[PDB]
């Protein structure tokens, strides 16, 4: 109310307050102008340390899904390499990536052979594989060509028997053992012990390795000195003791001071033997002692055994960020900018 | 006069400067918590990004040890496998335990003539089927095994395989096998397959052979030779037989056995009488003996294809549009320093 003494003291008071209002911006604008440098430091940290980093692996770790998938999808060619690295062109028997199951079945049905044999070949699918062969012919970087070879058959369903010969009392012994096949006007004979394969009812042999005989040699089982056939003989006068194990029984040729004993594993000894040839069957007989040599006729059981494991589980963790209320807090600051305009515009009314 | 005139606006700017500081309440607080906002993002790269990525950087780096253990060291990896199964004695020698060139050096190592050495370089595949490898010392850094190769005595003596057939009483031969010219004798091989198979060459053992005089070539004319006991199997009862060779066929047809030669494109060429006879494989492919059909020429099949197609890798790189964003930062960086023009010109008023 004292126009000179009043009306300017508070004006002096707001003078430095307005100077502090411009000393405000020193506190205000500097810390945010260097905060601009702070986010550029974070802009510089994603510049070289994040984005050049991750994409290098994105082609580097993508190489193994070529590498495993080179060995995943192309697996059938990968096995067939390594046998001809070792088996050297001739491979036996034919494997199952060399020739899988279905193209066996088609190539059986391809050939100009009767259904009477074709159904039999489909039956013994495993044995014919042991008589099949393959030879590498042409092998290049995009070319892989090899000759598949399969056998063909002449006769079907002629009967057979394996011999087991034993010395008979002077005291002689036999000569002839092997397989026997009914043939056209003839008896096929196989001198070698294992040209023929093993199956419960069937055998499969070669023809370039066989002997041919007349059917009168079935009468060699009665007479020795047959005028019908020179039944082959192995001479002796000095005795020799022998026993021959068959697949379904046993023959003994015990003699003299040799002690011979048939036995059972649950009934003990069933019997002993005299001087001379005798036959026993495998159902009650399992072990036979000849001299000090114990023989077995029935095969020996063992036990079972287990190698055990348990499955495994994959684990990771996903990714996450709590953005929304954070961005709503940004929206809270976004509110503060525009309601500051109410402080701006109302205070800026005073020009008029 | 105008006392209330220069005071009312002074009252008006009083709250305007008061609201100016009340604007700083709106100004300073939202940026002060924006400092907390970037620290949340500083806290999010603190634990959720930088500890994450580098764990795989040693974890996924382990497989480029694992595959590269099996990539570069592959030659030792196969040779572990056979002695796991072939058990010390390996036959025939593979091509990772002997990678081709160290055959060629070890051929040229041995004190044998060039006359044999060039022949061994020729049949590179057959000699591999007669070679052997035996494991001797196998440790964690030691892998020592014995490579074994055959040596040869004679070169280029002629040969022939026999095929006997019963001739008419009606007897039968016995002896079949291979025949080698020898110094003062004739080598003979009783066993069917001690000798290996090649179109012009055979390769057999010597501890498994028989020795014969050269007069046994005359067994093909005379049977009861005073020069040599040409072997025989007795018979009076007849037996019908046919023997397939590699390059033809022999028949010993007789009696009421019906025997027929044929061709797959010309049908039947002929039939046969009672007695031995020879046919060649060029016109003849099938021969029926009794009910047994034989084949002389091998049977063609077809071709078959297992087909695939190549695969393609794909990814996407990384990217960011930084520059105009940083120019927009530079736009704000302009705003800080031109604010100084609002600062300093307003701050002239002290003097």
């Amino acid at each position, epitope marked *: 109310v004292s126009k000179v003494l009043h009306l300017e003291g508070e004006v002096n008071k707001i003078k430095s307050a307005l100077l502090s209002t411009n000393k405000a911006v020193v506190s205000l604008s500097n810390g945010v102008s260097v905060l601009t440098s702070k986010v550029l430091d974070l802009k510089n940290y994603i510049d070289k340390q994040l984005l050049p980093i991750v994409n290098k692996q994105s082609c580097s770790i993508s190489n193994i899904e070529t590498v495993i998938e080179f060995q995943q999808k192309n697996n059938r060619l990968l096995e067939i390499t390594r046998e001809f690295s070792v088996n050297a062109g001739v491979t036996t028997p034919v494997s199952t990536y060399m020739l899988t199951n279905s193209e066996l079945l088609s190539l059986i049905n391809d050939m*100009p052979i*009767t259904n009477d044999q074709k159904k039999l070949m489909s039956n013994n699918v495993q044995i014919v594989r042991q008589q099949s062969y393959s030879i590498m012919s042409i092998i290049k970087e995009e070319v892989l060509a090899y000759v598949v070879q399969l056998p063909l058959y002449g006769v079907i*369903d002629t009967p057979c028997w394996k011999l087991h010969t034993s010395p008979l009392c002077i005291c002689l012994t036999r000569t002839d053992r092997g397989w026997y096949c009914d043939n056209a006007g003839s008896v096929s004979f196989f001198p070698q012990a294992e040209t023929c394969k093993v199956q419960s009812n069937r055998v499969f042999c070669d023809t370039m390795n066989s002997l041919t005989l007349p059917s009168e040699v079935n009468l060699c089982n009665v007479d020795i000195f047959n005028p019908k056939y020179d039944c082959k003989i192995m001479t002796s006068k000095t005795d020799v003791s022998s026993s021959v194990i068959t697949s379904l029984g046993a023959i003994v040729s015990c003699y003299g001071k040799t002690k011979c004993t048939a036995s059972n594993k649950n009934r003990g000894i069933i019997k002993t033997f005299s001087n001379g040839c005798d036959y026993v069957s495998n159902k009650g007989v399992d072990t036979v002692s000849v001299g000090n040599t114990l023989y077995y006729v029935n095969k020996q059981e063992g036990k079972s055994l287990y190698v055990k494991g348990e499955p495994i589980i994959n684990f990771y963790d996903p990714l996450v960020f709590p953005s929304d209320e954070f961005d709503a807090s940004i929206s809270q600051v976004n509110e503060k900018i525009n309601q500051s305009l109410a402080f701006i515009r109302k205070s800026d009314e005073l020009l008029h | 006069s105008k006392v209330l005139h220069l005071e009312g606006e002074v009252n008006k700017i009083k709250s305007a400067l008061l609201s100016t500081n009340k604007a700083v309440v709106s100004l300073s607080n939202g940026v002060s918590v924006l400092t907390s906002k970037v620290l949340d993002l500083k806290n999010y790269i603190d634990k959720q990004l930088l500890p994450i990525v580098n764990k795989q950087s040693c974890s996924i780096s382990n497989i480029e040890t694992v595959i590269e253990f099996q990539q570069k060291n592959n030659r030792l990896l196969e040779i572990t496998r056979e002695f796991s199964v072939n058990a010390g004695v390996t036959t025939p020698v593979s091509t990772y335990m002997l990678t081709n060139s160290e055959l060629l050096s070890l051929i040229n190592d041995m004190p044998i003539t060039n006359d044999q050495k060039k022949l061994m370089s020729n049949n590179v595949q057959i000699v591999r089927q007669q070679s052997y490898s035996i494991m001797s010392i196998i440790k964690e850094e030691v892998l020592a095994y014995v490579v074994q190769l055959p040596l040869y005595g004679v070169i280029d003596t002629p040969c022939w395989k026999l095929h006997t057939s019963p001739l008419c009483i009606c007897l039968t031969r016995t002896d079949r096998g291979w025949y080698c010219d020898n110094a003062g004798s004739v080598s003979f091989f009783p066993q069917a397959e001690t000798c290996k198979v090649q179109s012009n060459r055979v390769f057999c053992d010597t501890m498994n052979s028989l020795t014969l005089p050269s007069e046994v070539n005359l067994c093909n004319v005379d049977i009861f030779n005073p020069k040599y006991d040409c072997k025989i199997m007795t018979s009076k009862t007849d037996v019908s037989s046919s023997v397939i060779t590699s390059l033809g066929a022999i028949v010993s047809c007789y009696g009421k056995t019906k025997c027929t030669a044929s061709n*797959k*494109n*010309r049908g039947i060429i002929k*039939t046969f009488s009672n007695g031995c006879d020879y046919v060649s494989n060029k016109g003849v492919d099938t021969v*029926s003996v009794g*009910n047994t059909l034989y084949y002389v020429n091998k049977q063609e099949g077809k071709s078959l294809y297992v087909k695939g197609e190549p695969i393609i890798n794909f990814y996407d790189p990384l990217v960011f549009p930084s520059d105009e964003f940083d120019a927009s930062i530079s736009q704000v960086n302009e705003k800080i320093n031109q604010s100084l023009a609002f600062i300093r010109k307003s701050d002239e008023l002290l003097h």
Partner: antibody, heavy 114, light 108 residues
Framework: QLQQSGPELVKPGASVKISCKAS????????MSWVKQRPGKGLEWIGR????????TYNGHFKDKAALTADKSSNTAYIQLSSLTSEDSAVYFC?????????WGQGTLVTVSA | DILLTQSQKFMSTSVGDRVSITCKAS??????VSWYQRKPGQSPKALIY???NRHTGVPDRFTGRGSGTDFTLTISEVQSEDLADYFC?????????FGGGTKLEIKR
């Protein structure tokens, strides 16, 4: 060999099996077949079966009229011929088509029961 | 299926004659066929096995060839006893189709 039964009468409302027995022959491991004949139409294939394994085929134009069975113990086949008419009246043949056995049955004179 | 077409139904020759008979097919079947005879009121008989093989108990004047879709059945030196009906049969893949059937006659 083989042996086949005698004549037959079909009927609207009937299905019947016919007996063919393997007359003294190794049987269990070889095919069988059937073929019908009508004069003015000639021979007509029916189907084929294998015994003791049960491979059964069909002429698809004929497939729904009949069904194929067999005995492996007494070696006797059967074929259940459903309700047909006089246009299917024919003589029917049990026949094996082996290289070992090309054999043929005794025929089966079949007309309509009337 | 695969259709079979014969040339004709009847014949006319003299006795002791050589007759060439061919039926054809639509597709190559890899030699898996056979030929037959047939007599009235009597069972048929298989003659040429795998299109090549004369079966057991069959006279030697009976010949056959062919490899593709076309197959020749050539009979030589006919007699009065051989006047039967004759036909083929598809024998390779099911279904099995017949030839047209051909009755053999002379002088007409």
């Amino acid at each position: 060999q083989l042996q086949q039964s005698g004549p037959e009468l079909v009927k609207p409302g009937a299905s019947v099996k016919i007996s063919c027995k393997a007359s003294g022959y190794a049987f269990s491991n070889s095919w069988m077949s059937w073929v019908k004949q009508r004069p003015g139409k000639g021979l007509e294939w029916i189907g084929r079966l294998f015994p003791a394994d049960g491979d059964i085929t069909y002429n698809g134009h004929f497939k729904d009229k009949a069904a194929l069975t067999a005995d492996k113990s007494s070696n006797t086949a059967y074929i259940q011929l459903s309700s047909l008419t006089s246009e299917d009246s024919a003589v029917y043949f049990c026949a094996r088509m082996d290289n070992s056995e090309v054999f043929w049955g005794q025929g089966t004179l079949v007309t309509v029961s009337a | 299926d695969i259709l079979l077409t014969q040339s004709q139904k009847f014949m006319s020759t003299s006795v002791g004659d050589r007759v060439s008979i061919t039926c054809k097919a639509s597709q190559n079947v890899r030699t898996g066929v056979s030929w037959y005879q047939r007599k009235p009121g009597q069972s048929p008989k298989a003659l040429i096995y795998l299109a090549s093989n004369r079966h057991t108990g069959v006279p030697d004047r009976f010949t056959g060839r062919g490899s593709g879709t076309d197959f020749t059945l050539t009979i030589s030196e006919v007699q009065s006893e051989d006047l039967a009906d004759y036909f083929c049969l598809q024998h390779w893949t099911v279904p099995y189709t017949f030839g047209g059937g051909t009755k053999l006659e002379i002088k007409r």
